[PDB]
Design a protein around this ligand. Structure first.
Ligand SMILES: [Mg+2]
Ligand SMILES: [Mg+2]
Ligand SMILES: [Mg+2]
Ligand SMILES: [Mg+2]
Ligand SMILES: [Mg+2]
Ligand SMILES: [Mg+2]
Ligand SMILES: [Mg+2]
Ligand SMILES: [Mg+2]
Ligand SMILES: [Mg+2]
Lengths: 53, 128, 125, 63, 109, 225, 240
RNA sequence: CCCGUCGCCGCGCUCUCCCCCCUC
RNA sequence: CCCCGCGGACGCUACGCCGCGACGAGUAGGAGGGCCGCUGCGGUGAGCCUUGAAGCCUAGGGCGCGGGCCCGGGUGGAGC
């Protein structure tokens, strides 16, 4: 499945296929790691915080 | 008249009374909510005879009849009709009940839908 | 893949209801509405769901087609059965069993269709 | 009462990975089934290694 | 037309010196003062009959103030003709020194 | 091919049935032979004593080779050596019984734990009732009731012991595989003696219960199970 | 097919026959009885009838369910005992034999002394302390709740009618067949009526029981009186 | 396919024919 | 080569479900689990709410070994 790389149609502003296709970027077959995403999200939401004392 | 559960076993409660806190009788500042005694000389903790009993795992209910209402069902809290339809395939084991903050006009519709779906409601006449 | 997506949504999903020591899952094509790998209505290449008809009579049997897995607009074929109860159950049984289309959901779909039809017949006094 | 000691009753060992990695847990499911349903001891060793921590799974060099 | 039940006295609960097992009771049956005489009464139904304030339904009759706790003799107690009895609900402690009836109902003679 | 596989399954099941019947017949005949052996031993002792008395001499019977040991005291305040010997005898609870093959090594262990045990020489009826009413096997480290001969045959079949009769024989006559059969037996969990004890803190010969009572252990066993 | 034979193995103790395997083999002559080797229509066809309506229809009996409950109950395991009550064995106390005088202990005939006739198929005793003596008709009673006295009469050669069975003595009732909401009273028919058949049978049995009762002195007065516990007497000391 | 009266174990009868005793 | 029957319960949140055996004292102390509880943030519940939120009161109905929780009635008046 990872080696599979389909063609995704590009849709027009009217919502219909325009006949153009883009091969799926390989990033959409990257591993899905909810634990890593949670770790990065948890540690990156702390960075916009404003100090209180 | 009421909808009946799938099976109606005999519910055996090992203990029927609450576990009151030690000395919650002698004080108003001490609520009856159970707190484990940790005093060095506490006779309830040391389990002397005639004292307040301590909750432990041996009092646990039979897993077949745990969380089971006297009607034979198990309750599920619902806040609207959509949450009510999750019990469509659990008609004869789980009974819905409407949340306390659901308005009267909305709980009327929930009651009607539950009657249609043959779901038992533990508080069907609650705001009227 | 079904197992990979299940490892993602088994405890983190907007359809998840964890309450009263019970767990329910409310995605559209879930028979028995339980949080389970077998009955999840989203993660499988082929799913079957039974819903009440748009009007107050009949059932809608919706099955997932094979080709457009990533195209949710056309991924589901819905048919309406508005016959008597025995013929409706026979139709659903033949959709699931004869097609070999996910035969582990046959009795779940039959029982859900029975529940829907029984709810559609008028309430008693 | 019986005259036994209970300080060694609970055996301390990994029964599952402490990791929440879903791909690791998937292949743990696979090799759990393999270990249960085959007589091979290779599968059992591989499964118990999959449970292990990173310091118990040191890297292996090409040399 | 006649009594048809032996008179017994609710003597107390089955007990040690400082522990009390209220689930079973000791009865002194009149005229039974040896352990070898208690064989007749084993298994016999025994009732503690009392009166209360509210009326309760009477089987085969109109409601009256009479209530009853049923039980049966289970075994002999001691050497002096006392017997043990298990009632459906543990006998109230106000009944100590009061009348129990032993009804002969499940007779073996 | 349905008929062929049906015939194959029928032949397999018939072969299973024939093997089971052969095993049942073997068990039956082994039990009959053991009955013959038991009565021969019982009569031989009487005959030897009779001929000694006829000659005017004494027949001294063989010292008993089998003992039944019951732990009669509890687990509180036990000295370390007594504790270790009781664990080696597998008596870790009060009113736990076990069989002990008697020799110098085991007797000198019994002398250590004498205040804590009541032991003696079980007879055939005692062995029978202990195995049949309270016999459990240590099968895969579990205490499994001996409800089927297959349980005995799976664990002790390699020693020729394939039934309760074989087990009883191997215990009563000590035999060559006594260690295996006895350790296969989970220690017996007897009840409290019905009728009471005389005095558990003193020896039997001074009016108590501890120590060696030669053949009164059978009277004790009848009440403890 | 051959006609059935008796057991050919007498029961000396329950579960053990008198003869062994080989003895039974020879008694059955199994040496010459050796053998080496050698439904219900689900659907019915019916002529439906009608021009161009097809010839017939294969109508299946035993149609499939129209509705399925949301959940079911697993079936029970098999228990190898536990016969129904109609097939239970019936045990009667040795002291209770036909003609024995019994003391009823429960019911409206509490304390009355009646005559025992026979044990019915359900194990209930059939008694009639004759209706002219103590107002006890042909009635059923439970042997647990009677005291068997040592006084008896020889009621051998009296004929109990064959139709005096448990089905004969079973109670009759009929309520709310067409009646659903109880506001109009159904409290009629509560008066049980003595059937003339019951009167006929009572007279038939009494006409041959009473002459035997009058044979021995002051038995009729004994049957007329009721049993009571005097404050000095004790049932464990009483010989009944 | 109307609800596995099922496994192990112990038995009985028939697929052989005569008789004997009560009963229709 | 199943077919007069086209048919046949449940299950398997695999972090789930099932079976079998033994066991259960505990201060100081350690560990695990907590669908115990409080406040706030990111998501999510096409969540709840003036046809009545929070809070409080309650000889009301219950659940859990328990921490606690849910529901009824009242009061309250804007949020949870
Ligand atoms: Mg409680
Ligand atoms: Mg207080
Ligand atoms: Mg102290
Ligand atoms: Mg400890
Ligand atoms: Mg001591
Ligand atoms: Mg005694
Ligand atoms: Mg001492
Ligand atoms: Mg313990
Ligand atoms: Mg502890």
């Amino acid at each position: 499945m990872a080696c599979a790389r389909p063609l995704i149609s590009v849709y027009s502003e009217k919502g219909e296929s325009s006949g153009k296709n883009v091969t799926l970027p390989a990033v959409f077959k990257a591993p899905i790691r909810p634990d890593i995403v949670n770790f990065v999200h948890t540690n990156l939401r702390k960075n916009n915080r404003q100090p209180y004392a | 008249a009421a909808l009946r559960p799938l099976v109606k076993p005999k519910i055996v409660k090992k203990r029927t009374k609450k576990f009151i806190r030690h000395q919650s009788d002698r004080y108003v500042k001490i609520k009856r909510n159970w707190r484990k005694p940790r005093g060095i000389d506490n006779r309830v903790r040391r389990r002397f005879k005639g004292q307040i009993l301590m909750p432990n795992i041996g009092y646990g209910s039979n897993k077949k009849t745990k969380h089971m209402l006297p009607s034979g069902f198990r309750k599920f809290l619902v806040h609207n009709v959509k949450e009510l339809e999750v019990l469509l395939m659990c008609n004869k084991s789980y009974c819905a009940e409407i949340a306390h903050n659901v308005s009267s006009k909305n709980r009327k519709a929930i009651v009607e839908r539950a009657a249609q779906l043959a779901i038992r409601v533990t508080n069907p006449n609650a705001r009227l | 893949s079904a197992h990979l997506q299940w490892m993602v949504v088994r405890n983190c999903s907007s359809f998840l209801i964890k309450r009263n020591k019970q767990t329910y899952s409310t995605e559209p094509n879930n028979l028995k509405a339980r949080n389970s790998f077998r009955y999840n209505g989203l993660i499988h290449r082929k799913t079957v769901g039974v819903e009440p008809a748009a009007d107050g009579k009949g059932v809608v049997v919706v099955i997932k087609r094979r080709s457009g897995q990533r195209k949710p607009a056309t991924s589901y074929v819905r048919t309406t059965i508005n016959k008597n109860a025995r013929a409706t159950l026979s139709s659903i049984r033949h959709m699931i069993r004869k097609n070999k289309y996910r035969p582990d959901l046959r009795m779940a779909a039959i029982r859900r269709a029975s529940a829907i039809l029984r709810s559609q017949k008028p309430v008693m006094v | 009462g019986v005259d036994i000691r209970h300080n060694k009753d609970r055996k301390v060992r990994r029964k599952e990975p402490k990791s929440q990695d879903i791909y690791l847990r998937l292949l743990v499911k696979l090799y759990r089934f393999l270990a249960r349903r085959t007589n091979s001891t290779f599968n059992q060793v591989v499964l118990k290694r999959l449970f292990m921590s990173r310091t118990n799974r040191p890297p292996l060099s090409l040399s | 037309s006649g009594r048809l039940w032996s008179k017994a006295i609710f003597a107390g609960y089955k007990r040690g010196l400082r522990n009390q097992r209220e689930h079973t009771a000791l009865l002194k049956i009149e005229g039974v003062y040896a352990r070898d005489e208690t064989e007749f009464y084993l298994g016999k139904r025994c009732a503690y009959v009392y009166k209360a304030k509210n009326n309760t339904v009477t089987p085969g009759g109109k409601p009256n103030k009479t209530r009853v706790i049923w039980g049966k003799v289970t075994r002999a107690h001691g050497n002096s003709g006392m017997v043990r009895a298990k009632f459906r609900s543990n006998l109230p402690a106000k009944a100590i020194g009061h009348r129990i009836r032993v009804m002969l109902y499940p007779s073996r003679i | 091919n349905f008929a062929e596989l049906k015939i194959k399954r029928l032949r397999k099941k018939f072969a299973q049935k024939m093997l089971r019947k052969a095993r049942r017949k073997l068990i039956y005949e082994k039990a009959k032979h053991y009955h013959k052996e038991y009565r021969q031993m019982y009569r031989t002792e009487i005959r030897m004593a009779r001929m000694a008395r006829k000659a005017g001499n004494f027949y001294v019977p063989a010292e008993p080779k089998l003992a039944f040991v019951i732990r009669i005291r509890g687990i509180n305040g036990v000295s370390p050596k007594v504790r270790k010997v009781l664990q080696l005898l597998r008596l870790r609870q009060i009113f736990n019984g076990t069989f002990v093959k008697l020799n110098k090594a085991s007797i000198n262990m019994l002398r250590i734990v004498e205040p804590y045990i009541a032991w003696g020489y079980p007879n055939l009826k005692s062995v029978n009732e202990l195995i049949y009413k309270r016999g459990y096997g240590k099968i895969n480290k579990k205490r499994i009731a001996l409800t089927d001969n297959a349980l005995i045959a799976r664990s002790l079949g390699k020693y020729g012991i394939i039934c309760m009769e074989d087990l009883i024989h191997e215990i009563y006559t000590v035999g060559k595989r006594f260690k295996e059969a006895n350790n296969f037996l989970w220690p017996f969990k007897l009840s409290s003696p019905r009728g009471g004890m005389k005095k558990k803190t003193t020896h039997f010969v001074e009016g108590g219960d501890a120590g060696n009572r030669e053949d009164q252990i059978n009277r004790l066993i009848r009440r403890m199970n | 097919k051959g006609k059935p034979h008796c057991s050919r193995n007498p029961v000396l103790v329950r579960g053990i026959g008198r003869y062994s395997r080989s003895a039974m083999y020879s008694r059955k002559a199994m040496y010459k009885r050796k053998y080496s080797a050698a439904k219900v229509l689900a659907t019915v066809t019916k002529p439906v009838g009608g021009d161009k309506n097809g010839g017939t229809r294969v109508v299946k009996l035993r149609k499939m369910p129209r509705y399925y409950p949301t959940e079911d109950v697993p079936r029970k395991l098999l228990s190898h005992g536990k016969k129904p009550f109609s097939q239970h064995v019936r045990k009667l106390r040795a002291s209770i034999t036909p003609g024995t005088i019994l003391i009823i202990l429960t019911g409206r005939h509490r304390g009355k002394r009646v005559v025992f006739l026979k044990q019915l198929a359900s194990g209930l005793l059939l008694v009639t302390g004759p209706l002219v003596l103590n107002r006890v008709p042909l009635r059923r009673t439970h042997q647990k709740f009677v005291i068997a006295t040592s006084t008896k009469i020889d009621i051998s050669n009296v004929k109990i009618p064959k139709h005096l069975t448990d089905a004969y003595f079973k109670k009759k009732k009929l309520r709310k067949p067409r009646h659903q909401e109880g506001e109009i009273f159904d409290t009629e028919k509560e008066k049980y009526e003595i059937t003339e058949q019951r009167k006929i049978d009572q007279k038939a049995v009494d006409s041959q029981i009473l002459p035997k009762i009058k044979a021995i002195p002051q038995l009729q007065g004994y049957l007329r009186s009721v049993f009571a516990l005097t404050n000095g007497i004790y049932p464990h000391k009483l010989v009944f």
